[PDB]
């Protein structure tokens, strides 16, 4: 894998390679997303979930949410990728989290980035001020938070007001990944990813983890591609066999535009190559990653 990386670097072909992927990517209808009644449920007019893989809310009125089920058969892991919720779709977001039985939510953006709103404040910032989503009959409370230098992990309590059932939802918020950009380092990215993994959130016993950024395709796609490739390396009898470009095209069958710049693609290669060290056994790389990430 690093041989291909090295030759892409020498040839200076990241852009051409990335554009080939965009050209070969699947094109499926998004008719439900484009219905006039769903216009205000979409943050961006050009980013819509394909009809075949969209997540359907269990409400009869309108079951539409800009969210997609990325089901990776060989890796044996599913993820739900969605846009940052809008002021009017936060209830829908939590209804999806509840109905799909997700245990973790991975957020890779900030509410405001460079002077622009990118996502509604869909969770409580203060313990004493819980949130009620009236349209969906759900209550959400901030139980605690572990704030790190570049990411924060939060314990949220989500309650179905109707049945009184409550669930602990873990929120993994990466706060320093710029839009259309990349993480500070493979180490910082991997330190975070393994925190999500170690939490049990990605376990097949739970529903799919919900991953989102602003549009739910650039940063979210980078995060899922690296996680999936590392999973495939650990699975197969020969990790060198993992073709990251093939994996990305496979993921793009479930949601459009995953990975938004040639450099996020190049970063994905670095993340997988670095993470592979842990998969192949190295028990000193993780601490290395933590030290390198300066999470304190
Ligand atoms: O690293 C990233 C990129 C962010 C991001 C990606 C796409 C968009 C959608 C934008 N839509 S628009 O209505 O603001 C907009 C802005 C400029 C030109 C244009 F035609 C529309 C967007 N579209 C292109 C990107 C693009 C191009 C073709 C098809 C689908 C696309 F998403 C660039 N930004 C917003 C944020 S993320 O939150 O997914 N992580
Ligand atoms: Mg306080």
UniProtKB/Swiss-Prot annotation:
This is Tyrosine-protein phosphatase non-receptor type 1. It is a peripheral membrane protein. The active site is at 213 (phosphocysteine intermediate). The modification S-nitrosocysteine is found at residue 213. GO terms for cellular component: cytoplasm; cytoplasmic side of endoplasmic reticulum membrane; cytosol; early endosome; endoplasmic reticulum; endosome lumen; glutamatergic synapse; mitochondrial crista. Residues 1-275 form the Tyrosine-protein phosphatase domain. The keyword Cytoplasm does not apply. The modification Cysteine sulfenic acid (-SOH) is found at residue 213. The modification Cysteine persulfide is found at residue 213. It is found in: Endoplasmic reticulum membrane. It comes from the Eukaryota. Tyrosine-protein phosphatase which acts as a regulator of endoplasmic reticulum unfolded protein response. Mediates dephosphorylation of EIF2AK3/PERK; inactivating the protein kinase activity of EIF2AK3/PERK. May play an important role in CKII- and p60c-src-induced signal transduction cascades. May regulate the EFNA5-EPHA3 signaling pathway which modulates cell reorganization and cell-cell repulsion. May also regulate the hepatocyte growth factor receptor signaling pathway through dephosphorylation of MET. Substrate binds at residues 179, 213-219, 260. GO terms for biological process: actin cytoskeleton organization; cellular response to angiotensin; cellular response to fibroblast growth factor stimulus; cellular response to hypoxia; cellular response to nerve growth factor stimulus; cellular response to nitric oxide; cellular response to platelet-derived growth factor stimulus; cellular response to unfolded protein. Oxidized on Cys-213; the Cys-SOH formed in response to redox signaling reacts with the alpha-amido of the following residue to form a sulfenamide cross-link, triggering a conformational change that inhibits substrate binding and activity. The active site can be restored by reduction. Belongs to the protein-tyrosine phosphatase family. Non-receptor class 1 subfamily. Expressed in keratinocytes (at protein level). GO terms for molecular function: cadherin binding; enzyme binding; ephrin receptor binding; insulin receptor binding; non-membrane spanning protein tyrosine phosphatase activity; protein kinase binding; protein phosphatase 2A binding; protein tyrosine phosphatase activity. Disulfide bonds: none annotated. Interacts with EPHA3 (phosphorylated); dephosphorylates EPHA3 and may regulate its trafficking and function. Interacts with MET. Interacts with NCK1. Its EC number is 3.1.3.48. It is an enzyme of class 3 (hydrolase). The keyword Ribonucleoprotein does not apply. Keywords: Acetylation, Endoplasmic reticulum, Hydrolase, Membrane, Oxidation, Phosphoprotein, Protein phosphatase, S-nitrosylation. It comes from Homo sapiens (Human).
């Amino acid at each position: 894998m690093e041989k291909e990386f090295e030759q892409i670097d020498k040839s200076g072909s990241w852009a051409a390679i990335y554009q080939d992927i965009r050209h070969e990517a699947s094109d499926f209808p998004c008719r439900v997303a484009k219905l006039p009644k769903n216009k205000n449920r979409n943050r961006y007019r050009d980013v819509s979930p394909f009809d075949h893989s969209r997540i359907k809310l269990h409400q009869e009125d309108n079951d539409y949410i800009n969210a997609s089920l990325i089901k990776m058969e060989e890796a044996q892991r599913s993820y739900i990728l969605t846009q940052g919720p809008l002021p009017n779709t936060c209830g829908h977001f939590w209804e999806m989290v509840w109905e799909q039985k997700s245990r973790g939510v991975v957020m890779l953006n900030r509410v405001m980035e460079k002077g622009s709103l990118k996502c509604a404040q869909y969770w409580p910032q203060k313990e004493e001020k819980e949130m009620i989503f009236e349209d969906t009959n759900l209550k959400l409370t901030l139980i605690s938070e572990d704030i790190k230098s570049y990411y924060t992990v939060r314990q949220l309590e989500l309650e179905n007001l109707t049945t009184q059932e409550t669930r602990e939802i873990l929120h993994f918020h990466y706060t320093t990944w710029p839009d259309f950009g990349v993480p500070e380092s493979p180490a910082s990215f991997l330190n975070f990813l393994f925190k999500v993994r170690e939490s049990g959130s990605l376990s097949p016993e739970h529903g799919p983890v919900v991953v989102h950024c602003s549009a739910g395709i650039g940063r979210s796609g980078t995060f899922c591609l690296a996680d999936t490739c590392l999973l495939l390396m650990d699975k197969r009898k020969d990790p060198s066999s993992v073709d990251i470009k093939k994996v990305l095209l496979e993921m793009r069958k479930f949601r459009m535009g995953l990975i938004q710049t040639a450099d996020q693609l190049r970063f994905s290669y670095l993340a997988v190559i670095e993470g592979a060290k842990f998969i192949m056994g190295d028990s000193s790389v993780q601490d290395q990653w933590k030290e390198l990430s300066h999470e304190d």
